[PDB]
Amino acid sequence: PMKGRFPIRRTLQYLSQGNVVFKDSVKVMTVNYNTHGELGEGARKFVFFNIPQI
Amino acid sequence: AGSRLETVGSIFSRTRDLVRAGVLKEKPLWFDVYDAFPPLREPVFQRPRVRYGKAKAPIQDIWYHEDRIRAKFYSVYGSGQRAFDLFNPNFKSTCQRFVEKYTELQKLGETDEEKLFVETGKALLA
Amino acid sequence: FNDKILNEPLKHSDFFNVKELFSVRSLFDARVHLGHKAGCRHRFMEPYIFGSRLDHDIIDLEQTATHLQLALNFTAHMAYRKGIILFISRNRQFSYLIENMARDCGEYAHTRYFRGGMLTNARLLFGPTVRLPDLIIFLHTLNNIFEPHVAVRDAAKMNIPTVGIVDTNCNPCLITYPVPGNDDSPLAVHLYCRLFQTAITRAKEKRQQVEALYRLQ
Amino acid sequence: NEDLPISMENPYKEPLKKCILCGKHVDYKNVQLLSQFVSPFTGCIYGRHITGLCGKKQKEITKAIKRAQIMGFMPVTYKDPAYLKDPKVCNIRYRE
Amino acid sequence: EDFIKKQIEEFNIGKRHLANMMGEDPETFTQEDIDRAIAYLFPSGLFEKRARPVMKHPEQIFPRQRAIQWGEDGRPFHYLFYTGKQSYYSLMHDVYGMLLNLEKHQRWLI
Amino acid sequence: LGPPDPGPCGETYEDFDTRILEVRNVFTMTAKEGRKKSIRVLVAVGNGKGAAGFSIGKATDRMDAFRKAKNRAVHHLHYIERYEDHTIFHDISLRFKRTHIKMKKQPKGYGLRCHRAIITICRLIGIKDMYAKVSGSINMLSLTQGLFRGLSRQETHQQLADKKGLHVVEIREECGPLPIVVASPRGPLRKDPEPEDEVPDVKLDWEDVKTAQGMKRSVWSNLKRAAT
Amino acid sequence: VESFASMLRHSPLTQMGPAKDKLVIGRIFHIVENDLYIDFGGKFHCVCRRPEVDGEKYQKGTRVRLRLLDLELTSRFLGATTDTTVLEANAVLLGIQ
Ligand SMILES: [Zn+2]
Ligand SMILES: [Zn+2]
């Protein structure tokens, strides 16, 4: 099987299951967060799972 | 004549499915008895593993309030000062009599350990 | 033609007054809760064992009494249906007592050297149409050598409701109705034997009474 | 209810035993103690199985013995005859 | 077990025949008459104590097959059947009990 | 071949059907007899409806070994909890010693895409069609043992519902959105829903992704197979 | 009706406390040609041969004294997942009463 942790993160189908489609305006998408800081669970989960979809 | 699958699981479900499919034409007489009063744990086969890593057992050492008293008694004085019987229930030997006199004095005294121990010793000598 | 035998006994809990045959105080008087050391203790025997007294395991008498009630009710219901019981023992500590008890009881026993598979190949070794043992009661699950007896293996291969007093070495998971508790003291063995004898006798008496009641028709 | 086990510090147990020199401070000048662990036939240092010392204590004892042998505070190939009055410390197998 | 009874009946019929037909009219003729008959009207021309014509009680010559210890419904009558050789184990248990009792109080065959 | 023989008192085992699987001629030298022409066989007997089971019977003969294996199988009848005789409960991803088993739940009329030995085993058990990727080495004995172990270790629907409590919700594509419960608890009912934690940790296989995305390509991908 | 722990809190094996160097009485239930199946109520039992004093007197149903030297007597060895248990005590003897 896949040699990763969360294989569902990269399966095409899971990526196509998205919905958000940025309009023809935004040019750059910068993101930054602290991983050791557990307070930022939302940003961590986002950068981990939704970045492939975006 | 039947099956002899032992390293599979429980014999209850085995007999159940054998009677359902039609293998065991004659229903075993003990089926109803086992169904009326089942055990607390189904006899399922379990390979005898070993505690390798940090796995420990849930059993611990039992202790009572009289354990420390008896330890102090054995430390102060010598061994038992009476031919213990242990044949009749709740036998009253020298150590047991001392523990009883202590529990009568401590607890139910609220003072100190040395004074009450000396009092119990004097009572025993009496 | 008597279908009431499959409904009358299996209806009320402790039909033959199972809980009254023994007593919690009578069982504690034998110090059955005692056990071997933690090292000798088995892994699967941990849930049934309570604590330890300076590396001396103690077994909660409540679970043992419940298992004993269950096993006694099972044996009584089996005797009500006329069945064979097989006693096993090899420690050679109370073989004479177990033999005398088997003589007193209306069943058979075998507490001697068990040859290589006498129940598995009973077709050729024993007679072709032999009433195989419908129940097993272990008096000393641990034989002379630190090795689990083959009786449990033959039972699992023959599907027989196994009974016995499991110690802190065997695998209760392999036995159907295990009974944790001591298996070395003399008073405990005597009490267990007397309880089994009384249970068998009372079950036979109740069976005879129910047969007479049926015949009253 | 009032008879459940308690989380005590394991009573009925005696503290661990000690060697013949635990709560002490060895010194390279104590020729008597240094030679006590030496045979008067070949100057061999008794081992741990018979002597019964700990790792650190035995290491320090043998280091002091070696220092005394090198510097010149103890005979190497034999035991100091001027300090023979020593009780039976080690279990001298020879001579019974 | 039925074979044993059949052979016993056959031997009885043969004895009755050898008694009535032959001159030896008394049915109580011992084995000496049979031996004389074998020596005379049966010159085996051999010397084997086994192959020679030996027609006597079948139980004395046959390895009797133990009958069914139990009739119908199973349930062996003996309380020591699963121990193999019930007689030997019963004798051993009796000897052990006798020894225990006598302790509490305080050539062979082939 | 013919069915197994009955028992002494009865037990009409003629209903079951025998099916020899493999044959092997073993040559083992001895002290004087030389290379012993020993034969080892693994036969599987069983008509269906869950009643089945494998066995082994090695000997220096043919019919004797066959009947010995048949008797052993008769004395070793395995049962497999099934749900609607057509497909297995759920998929299994086992690793028996050195034989991998990657099964996939498929509907009726799909076809038997598995080892011929596995095809015969399913025909004897009752399963009609079910996909299975015979990964790893191809060891008949070990593969069959692993398949039997997997079939014996399966979580049914009724037992799972009784343990957890929640009902079996499903949205079949063949039928309409109307959900039909397959199993219900035997007493209680967990009023609270399952912890719907998205992006779970389900270690799926790369073959699943290759089949879903159609990326798999070879000279023997999904070609037409024989009939029957 | 007393609970299970209530009886264990006031039992002989628990009331005596430890098990090392004690004065306890015993009794015999079976006599051997030389050994003596001494008993004192508990888990296992003990054995001993005919001593000097009261040699021929220690018959079936007599009374003896024990010292309690590990009721179980068990030790773990190197090449053995299980500990080599003895299931006996064999404590030191003294006399009658
Ligand atoms: Zn044990
Ligand atoms: Zn040291």
Sequence-ordered strand ranges (E) for G45-97: 48-49, 63-66, 74-75, 84-85
Selected residues 5-44 of chain F with any CB under 8 Å from a CB in chain B: 7-11, 15
Handedness of CA D64, D67, D73, D75 (dihedral sign): positive
Q: Do D5 and B62 touch (CB under 8 A)?
A: yes
Tokens of F48: 């269906």
CA A25 distance to own-chain centroid? 20
User: Quick one: which ligand is closest to C149's CA?
Assistant: 1
Distances (CA, A) of B89 to C28, C127, F99, G68: 10, 51, 63, 19
* F-chain residue closest to A48, CA distance: F199
B–G CB contacts, 8 A cutoff, strictly below: 63
Q: Do F9 and C123 touch (CB under 8 A)?
A: no
Of E103, F36, B70, which is closest to residue G60 (Cα–Cα)? Answer: E103
Tokens of C48: 């049934």
CA C47 distance to own-chain centroid? 20
Q: Which residues from chain G sit within 8 angstroms of residue D14, using beta carbons?
A: none
CB C172 within 8 A of CB C80: no
Q: Which of G14, G45, G83 sits opposite C39 (nearest CB)?
A: G83
Q: Do A2 and F213 touch (CB under 8 A)?
A: no
> Could you give the CA distance from residue E33 to residue E45 in angstroms, rounded to a whole number?
19
> Three-state DSSP class for D95?
coil
CB G52 within 8 A of CB G93: no
Q: Which residues from chain E sit within 8 angstroms of residue C126, using beta carbons?
A: 82
Query: Kind and range of the H or E element at G27?
Result: strand G24-31
> Could you give the CA distance from residue C186 to residue G45 in angstroms, rounded to a whole number?
9
CB B9 within 8 A of CB B45: yes
Of G13, G25, G6, which is closest to residue G64 (Cα–Cα)? Answer: G25
Helices (H), C1-129: 18-21, 24-29, 61-80, 95-104
Of G30, G38, F37, C158, which is closest to residue B5 (Cα–Cα)? Answer: C158
Residue carrying the six token digits 């229930």: B89
Of E71, C81, A27, which is closest to residue B34 (Cα–Cα)? Answer: C81
How many Cα neighbours within 13 Å face the side chain of B113?
Answer: 6
The alpha carbon of residue G22 is apart from the nearest alpha carbon of chain E, in Å, by 30
What is the CA angle D65-D66-D67, rounded to 5?
90
Burial of C217 (0-12, 13-18, 19+ CB in 10 A): exposed
Tokens of A21: 């489609």
Q: Would you give the end-to-end CA distance of chain B in angstroms?
A: 77
Q: Which residues from chain G sit within 8 angstroms of residue B67, using beta carbons?
A: 17
CB F91 within 8 A of CB F105: yes
* CB-based contact, F77 to chain B, within 8 Å: yes
**Residue F28: phi, psi to the nearest 5?**
-125, 120
Helices (H), chain C: 18-21, 24-29, 61-80, 95-104, 151-158, 186-215
* CB-based contact, C121 to chain E, within 8 Å: no
What is the CA angle E82-E84-E89, rounded to 5?
100
DSSP strand pairing (G84-85 vs F93-96): unpaired
* CB-based contact, B54 to chain F, within 8 Å: no
Helices (H), chain D: 31-36, 48-51, 55-71
Q: For residue F99, what are the β-bridge partners? A: F96, F136
CB B15 within 8 A of CB B31: yes
Annotate C106-121 with DSSP letters as a single string: TS----S---TTTTTT
Tokens of G39: 């008993």
> Could you give the CA distance from residue B99 to residue D30 in angstroms, rounded to a whole number?
50
CB C51 within 8 A of CB B60: yes
User: Quick one: which ligand is closest to C40's CA?
Assistant: 1
Q: Do B3 and F49 touch (CB under 8 A)?
A: no
Buried b (16+ CB within 10 A) or exposed e, C116-151: eebbeebeeebeeebbebbbbbbbbbbbeeeebbbb
Tokens of B9: 């699981």
* DSSP state for residue D27 in the 8-state scheme: -
* G-chain residue closest to D12, CA distance: G18
Q: Which residues from chain C sit within 8 angstroms of residue G11, using beta carbons?
A: 28, 31
Distances (CA, A) of B76 to B70, B71, B79, B107: 10, 9, 10, 20
* C-chain residue closest to B24, CA distance: C159
Distance, CA C107 to ligand 1 centroid (Å)?
A: 26
Distances (CA, A) of G86 to C36, G72, G78, G90: 10, 7, 17, 10
Tokens of C170: 């065997």
| List of chains touching B (3+ CB pairs within 8 A) | C, D, F, G
**Residue G33: phi, psi to the nearest 5?**
-50, -30
Helices (H), chain F: 63-74, 116-125, 140-152, 157-164, 206-212
Annotate F9-38 with DSSP letters as a single string: S---GGGS-EEEEEEEEEEE--SSS-SEEE
CB G55 within 8 A of CB G95: no
* DSSP state for residue G91 in the 8-state scheme: P
> Could you give the CA distance from residue E36 to residue E47 in angstroms, rounded to a whole number?
15
> Could you give the CA distance from residue G85 to residue C35 in angstroms, rounded to a whole number?
12
CB C57 within 8 A of CB C36: yes
Distances (CA, A) of D53 to C5, C72, D76: 76, 59, 22
> Could you give the CA distance from residue A25 to residue F86 in angstroms, rounded to a whole number?
55
Q: Do F9 and C129 touch (CB under 8 A)?
A: yes
CB F35 within 8 A of CB F64: no
> Three-state DSSP class for F95?
strand
Long-range pairs for B89-94 at CB < 8 Å and ≥24 separation? B89/C29, B89/G11, B89/G12, B90/G10, B90/G11, B90/G12, B90/G15, B91/G12, B91/G15, B93/G15, B93/G16, B94/B124
> Could you give the CA distance from residue B36 to residue C15 in angstroms, rounded to a whole number?
12
Helices (H), A1-54: 13-16, 41-53
Q: For residue G63, what are the β-bridge partners? A: G27
> Could you give the CA distance from residue D27 to residue C212 in angstroms, rounded to a whole number?
97
Selected residues 1-60 of chain G with any CB under 8 Å from a CB in chain B: 8-18, 21-25, 27, 40-42
**Residue C158: phi, psi to the nearest 5?**
-110, -5
Q: Which residues from chain F sit within 8 angstroms of residue C128, using beta carbons?
A: 8
CB C18 within 8 A of CB C77: no
Q: What is the Cα gyration radius of chain G?
A: 16
CB F77 within 8 A of CB F52: yes
Annotate B56-72 with DSSP letters as a single string: --S--B---HHHHHHHH
Q: What is the Cα gyration radius of chain E?
A: 22
CB C168 within 8 A of CB C42: yes
The alpha carbon of residue F157 is apart from the nearest alpha carbon of chain A, in Å, by 25
CA F11 distance to own-chain centroid? 26
* CB-based contact, G59 to chain C, within 8 Å: no
Distance, CA F8 to ligand 2 centroid (Å)?
A: 76
Q: Which residues from chain G sit within 8 angstroms of residue D3, using beta carbons?
A: 3, 5-6, 8-9
How many Cα neighbours within 13 Å face the side chain of C107?
Answer: 31
CA C170 distance to own-chain centroid? 15
**Residue G85: phi, psi to the nearest 5?**
-90, 155
**Residue G10: phi, psi to the nearest 5?**
-130, 40
* G-chain residue closest to E102, CA distance: G31
DSSP strand pairing (G35-39 vs G48-49): antiparallel
The reply to whether omega before B107 is within 30° of 0 (cis) is yes
> Could you give the CA distance from residue C185 to residue G72 in angstroms, rounded to a whole number?
12
> Could you give the CA distance from residue C167 to residue C40 in angstroms, rounded to a whole number?
10
* CB-based contact, F152 to chain B, within 8 Å: yes
Q: Which residues contact F81 (CB under 8 A, 6 or more apart)?
A: B17, F50, F89, F154, F156
